[PDB]
């Protein structure tokens, strides 16, 4: 029967010890959740590209084991029987028998070796058979298993107990036991695949994940982690593979006479050589390529093996002779008298040079003597004449030199290769070959017409979109095959595992489904509703809900539909003094990596070849120390706005306003506040060259500036940012900060207890929100993760070849022969210098971004804190009050206290007010009415007052303004008079 | 010690930290291709290769036009391995002497240590400024009776040289 | 709603008084508007019409977004033309250097081509990062010219 | 990066892994700036609740 | 905001309550003489809300 091979097949690939590293690799591997041919009769199963074999528990013993391709002498055989505390791994052509034991342990035909001292095997023998690079591999991991019906879960990684150099082919196998229904055993497959292997603290592969199986597994593969979160992740590109190769060479079928150049042995002397023109055939290059009846076959451009694939516009076979020496002068640019006067190949030469041996054909008549490439001039002028001959009959012996000059993609190709023509196909993704235009695409018809002289078209980026197919002369367009950016809409391994897949800009026809303007999105279904966007999917459609994956039309916060009218006014009768934390970075981890040590691991050889590059590392070090001093400058500019350091009063009688969360904690040994301690907890190596310069202001020193700023804000308020600090009681400062946003101070003192309770409840809610979700303090977490990712990719560049033979420098490199050592260390110096330069460029851009945010934080703590910003929506959503810096590492967490109205009402309002035939406009506030009585009140707090001359001023009359209504305005003097 | 463990070349301290090596595994590796752990032949012991105590070198000089005493710096290094020698978080600084008094930061070393002063080079804890403990009270107000019209001059680079390398 | 819909929720305000307060907030007393409302509206609409006429015939009047779009198109076309660049590469610009070269020589020529194309793409990415820093400065300027 | 530098070819696709993670770094930078434009538009326009 | 106007931004144009600034054509740059109102000679009194 067939059962689910859950997770077996994994094993230690790289043979080296490793710890806590997710070293992804690709080998011939068993995919997860594959079908197996379990037998309760030995099925001779094809060893496709490696197989995975396991026995069952069944108690007892699995006796003996029989393997091998066919046992029929077509290949050398293979056998891994187990008996008598020995393992015969002989490759002998054993007996072909369906009922063996030593029934089939015979016929000694062409064996290798044998291994002993390994009598291995309720158990489970895990085996892997693979033949890669000609070295057969065997793996073993025997583990007891009580269950026999259903294969147990769990990850078991195998070990290379032996690495056989069998040097054979293996194309099938089986397993036949001895004789005593019967026991069972499993058989699986492998495929070219890639996994992501998670090693433990003891270098034990405790986990492994595929990626070719599940799009969720694709996300686990790309992000190089076993965990994924909210977010669409670009994985790969969905490419439609070609069906079957098509070759359309022209209708010509004759064979060109290459014998009328190569078999032509009466070459023409280099003084006046002969060039033969050839065309209109499909003559083969196989006879010249395979039969190497020559001495030198140097090809520039084409190669001897690929010559049969291309069809050429025109071929000229230059023919001349030259001595055995100076043959290297037949090369682009190579100097010499023959090259200087007789024959000079062009610098951009393209062709094959065949200096086939003529010790018997060349040899008198073959005379020899700047000039243009492919020049030709034969003439004769204490005289001087270049008439020289050579009457030879091995060092000085002349030879025969024939040069083929090809020109490609300039005209209708006329001489082709031996490849047989194949029927043309249309409207299907098919890889093609038209006169050598190798490529893959779909062939459609276009209204464009090729000119009769024209052969094939092109686009920008030298893409041959249109080619008139030869042998039919038909208009065609090489549209690229259906390609679409495949993405993943996953809800995170923490919550679910169901996955949704996106196909970027493909009509649904070409592979539920839900069409978007960004493309058809499988794995999800539309929802005729509006929920806040979770995973932006694209083109206005975005997404698990109720244990189901959805993909709906993105909500935009619904339609509030505010009620406009000529007199529609909403004045808030209540407010919430809410604190909002918009977190900003100010600095990053200073690196200042030792470039001469990073790129060159203290190698004397590498240092010279690096200083040869001319102060590259000088600029690198200067830029890195400049941005490090820039981090120090940002920290000083944001935290050190004040010179004097203020100690908070021992008695905090701040009108009921707790700052114990934000003021320094006496119990904690440091000055970090309880909210600062929460920040520090919840936000929370030295390698070659890499280092971390500690900030000038330490964490306790940065916290000391932060505490000084908080103390100045709560005791001196905003005056300490201008000059000397001025003692301000906190209720007074909050009254001033109300007065600075168009709301009268009385709101504070008449709501002092209420605002204090709101502030403290808000700060408790800030602590709770920061303690529940990382999204609250995600800003510095993201920037620190960005810096750590940059450092990790920088140090992983060490493990990158960059074109070199080995990534590691100290041992394998700086150890080659000094010339080749210089060549390979130059490849490494270029690669690592490019990696470090792109790292420092990304770091300079990131430092510019952090510097913009640091100037933002400096302008906030100079305006939000050290004053009160009239810039609406700058210090938090709402009318701003004040702010609190918090010394979070590599950033600041501002507590942007803001005034936000909550409860509204409806009133009848008029732009003006008319009394006794005379206009009256409000000095401050807006005229509104509960209905029968008109009132003016602050724009952002319903505090109605009767209208008197104090709150109104007169300008104009009651016949010019539209929208005016009458009312009565009283006298601030008549009741005083009366 | 510079070492040649059965082919591998390097330089570092060969500790004896505990690790478990599988029989087929010779040595460990870090994220890069630098071998953190190597199993010593002839003993099968575990040795965690750690790089030497390297680090940058700074100079605390007060200016040739003022003095000539030099205080070379050794950062991110314990001075247990090579004037009065002073240690801090940023490193161990020689050529300077710690002082308990708080002085303003002239030459910042790192990790709060700042530095000629009285024919000697010092290395003190940075004085963050005058510890002005403002006497706050629930009924205390400060009012300035006067002012100072001071023209603070800040300079901004608006336009660099219009270099036009062709 | 005026400005209140960004502080808290939307609080409806008739346009006359909203623009009266938008005078009051720049030192121009509100009494100007309540007497000049007709002329103010006429100048408003006439200036909108002037914008329309500048958009209909005057070129590069919207030259800033047009400029950034042209810059992006020029960068993309520069990448596309860099596809048609040699960087050496056996005097071949087609990536299909194979079907002409064996794996060793094809490898070295295509490695030169990858160095060239990777350098061009890295130049494009660096220029796009600097241009996106400029665009983000303008976007944080618009987000502060909004709100 | 795979299609730009290499396209349908696979041998240079293998060679591109040998040049470190430049493909991944560049693609991550492009995705970062794309999300950057998305959040620019959200901070400019979508700031209305 | 500070040359042809007065900036209400605290600690933006000169350390203090900014008055105005005089540009000066410094080479390849500019220099602002940020005239500022910086108080001094404080005197402590008793306050009430
Ligand atoms: C590596 O193996 C050691 C073996 O000592 C693990 O430490 C634990 O050690 C105690 C005995 O002192 C055992 O009872 C435990 O079973 C061991 N725990 C585990 C998880 O094996 C050490 O934890 C292992 N490290 C890892 C996580 O790989
Ligand atoms: C092994 O192969 C050789 C090939 O020459 C053959 O002659 C021989 O009979 C084969 N078998 C034995 C007996 O090893
Ligand atoms: C060419 O010469 C070879 C030997 O030099 C000979 O075998 C062959 O018949 C000749 N014909 C052609 C087509 O080359
Ligand atoms: C997809 O194809 C269908 C018919 O083939 C066409 O009607 C439709 O317009 C195409 N998709 C879009 C987005 O237009
Ligand atoms: C205003 O809202 C607060 C809570 O936000 C509430 O306690 C209070 O009763 C409301 N009304 C008044 C008049 O304060
Ligand atoms: C609020 O302040 C009082 C006295 O100032 C204090 O006892 C209490 O612990 C504070 N509240 C919190 C949550 O710390
Ligand atoms: C004001 O009146 C309109 C119309 O009845 C209503 O839709 C709205 O909810 C009311 N409230 C406010 C404060 O807008
Ligand atoms: C309007 O307000 C006044 C003063 O509060 C009150 O006397 C009157 O009853 C209110 N009228 C309405 C329409 O509720
Ligand atoms: C205000 O009263 C006058 C006469 O007292 C009247 O003519 C005028 O129309 C009134 N305003 C209105 C109705 O808006
Ligand atoms: C230097 O070594 C001593 C003792 O060997 C240790 O106490 C100290 O922590 C080390 N240096 C630092 C910076 O900790
Ligand atoms: C402030 O002034 C009062 C009255 O002169 C005086 O009693 C008090 O000591 C002064 N306090 C300070 C902080 O100097």
Swiss-Prot record, chain C:
As recorded in UniProt, coiled-coil segments are 66-110
- Please tell me, according to the UniProt entry, what happens when changing residue 144 to I: In strain: Gamma/P.1
Q: Where is this region: Heptad repeat 1?
A: 37-87
This molecule's function is given as: Subunit of the fusion protein that is processed upon entry into the host cell. Mediates fusion of the virion and cellular membranes by functioning as a class I viral fusion protein. Contains a viral fusion peptide that is unmasked after S2 cleavage. This cleavage can occur at the cell membrane by host TMPRSS2 or during endocytosis by host CSTL. In either case, this triggers an extensive and irreversible conformational change that leads to fusion of the viral envelope with the cellular cytoplasmic membrane, releasing viral genomic RNA into the host cell cytoplasm.
**Know the name of this protein?**
Spike protein S2'
UniProt lineage: Viruses, Riboviria, Orthornavirae, Pisuviricota, Pisoniviricetes
Swiss-Prot record, chain E:
Disulfide linkage: 2-13
Residues bearing glycans: 44
The effect annotated for residue 41 to H is: In strain: Kappa/B.1.617.1
Q: What does this protein do?
A: Subunit of the fusion protein that is processed upon entry into the host cell. Mediates fusion of the virion and cellular membranes by functioning as a class I viral fusion protein. Contains a viral fusion peptide that is unmasked after S2 cleavage. This cleavage can occur at the cell membrane by host TMPRSS2 or during endocytosis by host CSTL. In either case, this triggers an extensive and irreversible conformational change that leads to fusion of the viral envelope with the cellular cytoplasmic membrane, releasing viral genomic RNA into the host cell cytoplasm.
What is the official name of this protein in its record?
Spike protein S2'
């Amino acid at each position: 029967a067939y059962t689910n091979s859950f997770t077996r097949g994994v094993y230690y690939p790289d043979k080296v010890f490793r710890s806590s590293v997710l070293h992804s690799t690709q080998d011939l591997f068993l995919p997860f959740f594959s079908n197996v041919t379990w037998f309760h009769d030995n099925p001779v199963l094809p060893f496709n590209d490696g197989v995975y074999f396991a026995s069952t528990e069944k108690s007892n013993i699995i006796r003996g084991w029989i393997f091998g391709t066919t046992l029929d002498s077509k290949t050398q055989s293979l056998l891994i029987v187990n008996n008598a505390t020995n393992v015969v791994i002989k490759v002998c052509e054993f007996q072909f028998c369906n009922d063996p034991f030593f029934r089939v342990y015979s016929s000694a035909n062409n064996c290798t070796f044998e291994y002993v001292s390994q009598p291995f095997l309720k158990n489970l023998r895990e085996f892997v058979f693979k033949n890669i690079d000609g070295y057969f591999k065997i793996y073993s991991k025997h583990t007891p298993i009580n269950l026999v019906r259903d294969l147990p879960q769990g990850f078991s990684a195998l070990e290379p107990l032996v690495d056989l150099p069998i040097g054979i082919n293996i194309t099938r196998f089986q397993t036949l036991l001895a004789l005593h229904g019967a026991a069972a055993y499993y058989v699986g497959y492998l495929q070219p695949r890639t996994f992501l292997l998670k090693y433990n603290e003891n270098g034990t592969i405790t986990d492994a994940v595929d990626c070719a199986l599940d799009p969720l597994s694709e996300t686990k593969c790309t992000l190089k982690s076993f965990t994924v979160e909210k977010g669409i992740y670009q994985t790969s590109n969905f490419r439609v593979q070609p069906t079957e190769s098509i070759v359309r060479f022209p209708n010509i079928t004759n064979l060109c006479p290459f014998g009328e150049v190569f078999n032509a042995t009466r070459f023409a002397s280099v003084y006046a050589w002969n060039r033969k023109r050839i065309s209109n055939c499909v003559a083969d290059y196989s006879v010249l390529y395979n039969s190497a009846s020559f001495s030198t076959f140097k090809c520039y451009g084409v190669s001897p093996t690929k010559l049969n694939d291309l069809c050429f516009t025109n071929v000229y076979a230059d023919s001349f002779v030259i001595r055995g020496d100076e043959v290297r002068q037949i090369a682009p640019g190579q100097t010499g008298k023959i090259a200087d006067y007789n024959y000079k190949l062009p610098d951009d030469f393209t062709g094959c040079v065949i200096a086939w041996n003529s010790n018997n054909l060349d040899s008198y008549n073959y005379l020899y003597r700047n000039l243009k490439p492919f020049e030709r001039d034969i003439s004769t002028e204490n005289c001087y004449f270049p008439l020289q001959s050579y009457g030879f009959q091995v060092g000085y012996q002349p030879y025969r030199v024939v040069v083929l000059s090809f020109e490609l993609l300039h005209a209708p190709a006329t001489v082709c290769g031996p490849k047989k023509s194949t029927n043309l196909v249309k409207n299907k993704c098919v890889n093609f070959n038209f006169n050598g235009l190798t490529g893959t695409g779909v062939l459609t018809e276009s209204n464009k017409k090729f000119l009769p002289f024209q052969q094939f078209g092109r686009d920008i980026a030298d893409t041959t979109d249109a080619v008139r197919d030869p042998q039919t002369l038909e208009i065609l367009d090489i549209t690229p095959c259906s390609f679409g950016g495949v993405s993943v809409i996953t809800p995170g391994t923490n919550t679910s595992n169901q996955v949704a897949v996106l196909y970027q800009d493909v009509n649904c026809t070409e592979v539920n489904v839900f069409q978007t303007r960004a493309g058809c999105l499988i794995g999800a279904e539309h929802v005729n509703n509006s929920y806040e966007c979770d995973i932006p999917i694209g083109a206005g459609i975005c997404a698990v809900a109720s244990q189901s994956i959805i993909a709906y039309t993105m909500s935009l916060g619904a339609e509030n539909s505010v009620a406009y009218s000529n007199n529609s006014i909403a004045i808030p009768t209540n407010f919430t003094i809410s604190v909002t934390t918009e977190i900003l970075p100010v600095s990053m981890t200073k690196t200042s990596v030792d470039c001469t040590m990073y790129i060159c691991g203290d190698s004397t050889e590498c240092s010279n070849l690096l200083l040869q590059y001319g102060s590259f590392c000088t600029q690198l070090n200067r830029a890195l120390t400049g941005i490090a001093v820039e981090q120090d400058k940002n920290t000083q500019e944001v935290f050190a706005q004040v010179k004097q350091i203020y100690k908070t009063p021992p008695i905090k009688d701040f009108g009921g306003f707790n700052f114990s969360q934000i003021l320094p904690d006496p119990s904690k040994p440091s000055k970090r506040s309880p909210i600062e301690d929460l920040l520090f907890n919840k936000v929370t190596q030295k390698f070659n060259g890499l280092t971390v310069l500690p900030p000038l202001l330490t964490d306790e020193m940065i916290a000391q500036y932060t505490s000084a700023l908080l103390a100045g804000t709560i005791t001196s308020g905003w005056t300490f940012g201008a000059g000397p600090a001025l003692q301000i009681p906190f209720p007074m400062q909050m009254a001033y900060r109300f007065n600075g946003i168009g709301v009268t101070q009385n709101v504070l003192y008449e709501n002092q207890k209420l605002i204090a309770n709101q502030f403290n409840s808000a700060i408790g809610k800030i602590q709770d929100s920061l303690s529940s979700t990382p999204s609250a303090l995600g800003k510095l977490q993201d920037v620190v993760n960005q810096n750590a990712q940059a450092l990790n990719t920088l140090v992983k560049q060490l493990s990158s070849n960059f074109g070199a033979i080995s990534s590691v420098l100290n041992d394998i490199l700086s150890r080659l022969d000094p010339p080749e050592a210089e060549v390979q260390i130059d490849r490494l110096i270029t690669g690592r210098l490019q990696s470090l330069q792109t790292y420092v460029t990304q770091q300079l851009i990131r430092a510019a971004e952090i510097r913009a945010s640091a100037n933002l934080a400096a302008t906030k703590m100079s305006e939000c804190v050290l004053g009160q910003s009239k810039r609406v929506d700058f210090c938090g959503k709402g009318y701003h009050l004040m702010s609190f810096p918090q010394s979070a590492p590599h950033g600041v967490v501002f507590l942007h206290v803001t005034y936000v109205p909550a409860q509204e009402k409806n009133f009848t309002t008029a732009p003006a007010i008319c009394h006794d035939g005379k206009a009256h406009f409000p000095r401050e506030g807006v005229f509104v009415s509960n209905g029968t009585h008109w009132f003016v009140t602050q724009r952002n707090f319903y505090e109605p007052q009767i209208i008197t001359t104090d709150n109104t001023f007169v300008s104009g009359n009651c016949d010019v303004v539209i929208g005016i209504v009458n009312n009565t305005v009283y006298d601030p003097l008549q009741p005083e008079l009366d | 010690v510079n070492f040649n463990f059965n082919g591998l070349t390097g330089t570092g301290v060969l500790t004896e930290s505990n690790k478990k090596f599988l029989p087929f595994q010779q040595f460990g590796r870090d994220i890069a291709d630098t071998t953190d752990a190597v199993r010593d032949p002839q003993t099968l012991e575990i040795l965690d290769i750690t790089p030497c105590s390297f680090g940058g070198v700074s100079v605390i000089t007060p200016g040739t036009n003022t003095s000539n005493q030099v205080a070379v710096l050794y950062q991110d290094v314990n001075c247990t391995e090579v004037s009065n020698v002073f240690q801090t978080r940023a490193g161990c600084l020689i050529g300077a002497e710690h002082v308990n008094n708080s002085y303003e930061c002239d030459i910042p070393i790192g990790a709060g240590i700042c530095a000629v002063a009285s024919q000697s080079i010092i290395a003190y804890t940075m004085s963050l400024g005058a510890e002005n403990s403002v006497a706050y009270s629930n009924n205390s107000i400060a009012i300035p009776t006067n002012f100072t019209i001071s023209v603070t001059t800040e300079i901004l680079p608006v336009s660099m040289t219009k270099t036009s390398v062709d």
